[PDB]
Amino acid sequence: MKKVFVLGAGTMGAGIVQAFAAKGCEVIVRDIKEEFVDRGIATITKSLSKLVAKEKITEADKEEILSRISGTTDMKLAADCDLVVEAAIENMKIKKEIFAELDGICKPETILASNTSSLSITEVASATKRADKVIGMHFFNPAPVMKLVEVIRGAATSQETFDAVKEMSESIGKTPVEVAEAPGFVVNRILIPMINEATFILQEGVAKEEDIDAAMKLGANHPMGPLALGDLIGLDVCLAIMDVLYNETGDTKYRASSLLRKYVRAGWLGRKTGKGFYDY
Amino acid sequence: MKKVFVLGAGTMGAGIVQAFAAKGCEVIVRDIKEEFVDRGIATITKSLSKLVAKEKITEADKEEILSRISGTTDMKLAADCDLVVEAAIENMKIKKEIFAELDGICKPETILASNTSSLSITEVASATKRADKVIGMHFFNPAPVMKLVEVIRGAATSQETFDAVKEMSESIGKTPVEVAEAPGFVVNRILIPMINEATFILQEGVAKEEDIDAAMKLGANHPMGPLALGDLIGLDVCLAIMDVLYNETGDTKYRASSLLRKYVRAGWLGRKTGKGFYDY
């Protein structure tokens, strides 16, 4: 593969763009308004020169990265990409429309991947005439740094598509891992209920915030506590995944705490709002 | 507090003794046969030899730490101590006997503490005439290394007993965390169901063992994968904790997977039997 189309210039999207571009790929990023497109190319530029500002790479690098990246608000520029990675809104009806469009636009070889945290690759695939070519390719924030890629096979995803996405992952310096589509895949299915369990502990008067977090840091050697991790992931993203696990499985085991819900309702979403489990 | 009595010379009591003694407390460890007491001291000694080789302590420190440690079989030797920490077996009728004895034996001032991971402190405290000075002091293996202590207040634990146990934890360079007694406290309540989640994922054909573990290390920056981690903790201990959580809560959220329960029945308990989720 040489060329990649990335939908969404949000923070995941922008990270995905940088992860591909930084490793020699051509990347066209597409969003709904060029203010959005511009914001992302900015995010990356910032990102890169923070790196130059630690000798990690050079300006010759920084510039050759950025030359690999174009922006657009027009879906039609996906036509010739060898890969598409969709990092757009976590909404199935929309995703289905997006993928139906890419299917009409892209050359028959283009592989269409979602970065969806939660949602059905299979169902998305079914909106297309190339189910064998649709797959999940799931990165973790910040995508330039986190080395894991979950490669999620839908029911109809072929051995060849899997192999290609697996190879692509390797060539951009990540470690791919095979997942048969199921709710939450592997990482979030394990990780998010951990955070939710911390909010039950808090709700129930068992321990206060800083104690809960020190407990997992010093008691299990976790790099962050679950409440802080929450604030980093975004509490709305946390909530949404718990609601998807619960809804998919029908299993109350995955019920989100009322407390997590209250916080999301209050707009105390974490770092990005200045307030989550902690005041920032 | 300078004087600590530790019940039980298995590896948790031994590890604990070493923790108190490596920071200058005088410690008596007591067990039922003199041979057990001696395995415990031998353990601590091998542990302290490891530190000397790693140039972490000197021989002088080693001998110096051993010098504040006395073995015994005589429960009466607790009478004068400032703090008792019990690390005897996880059986309630016995704990109640043990704490009831210690109640008779000990000077009114002595705090009585249990390292129990899954029995009720409140329930043990009720077997004494001293509930206000009963408390959980929960270490993590290896006790000499793991900086966290969960300090578990039973319903009657005085603020004073709590404050004393906080200070003492801090004296030994550990970070205490206040926990109002509830099933699984903080750490195990989060950590064990995480492992159990991994087992369900495995059971359901979502991903293979190596992938589940690679995903958490690389996707979440966990120091080990959950299955490897279940093997290290012991699958029997994992199973048992999940059962406790489920039995205490009535909440089927905490139900162990059949597969975990099958591995326990096979004697595939982890590193300690040379086989759990992996072969060792």
From TrEMBL, chains A, B:
It holds the Pfam family 3HCDH_N. Belongs to the 3-hydroxyacyl-CoA dehydrogenase family. CoA binds at residues 47, 54, 117. Pathway: Lipid metabolism; butanoate metabolism. The keyword Methyltransferase does not apply. NAD(+) binds at residues 8-13, 30-31, 90, 95, 115, 117, 141, 272. Keywords: NAD, Nucleotide-binding, Oxidoreductase. Residues 184-280 form the 3-hydroxyacyl-CoA dehydrogenase C-terminal domain. GO terms for molecular function: 3-hydroxybutyryl-CoA dehydrogenase activity; NAD+ binding. Transmembrane segments: none annotated. GO terms for biological process: butyrate metabolic process; fatty acid beta-oxidation. The record marks 138 as: Important for catalytic activity. This is 3-hydroxybutyryl-CoA dehydrogenase. Residues 3-181 form the 3-hydroxyacyl-CoA dehydrogenase NAD binding domain. InterPro entries: 3-OHacyl-CoA_DH, 3-OHacyl-CoA_DH_CS, 3-OHacyl-CoA_DH_NAD-bd, 3HC_DH_C, 6-PGluconate_DH-like_C_sf, 6PGD_dom2, NAD(P)-bd_dom_sf. The gene is hbd.
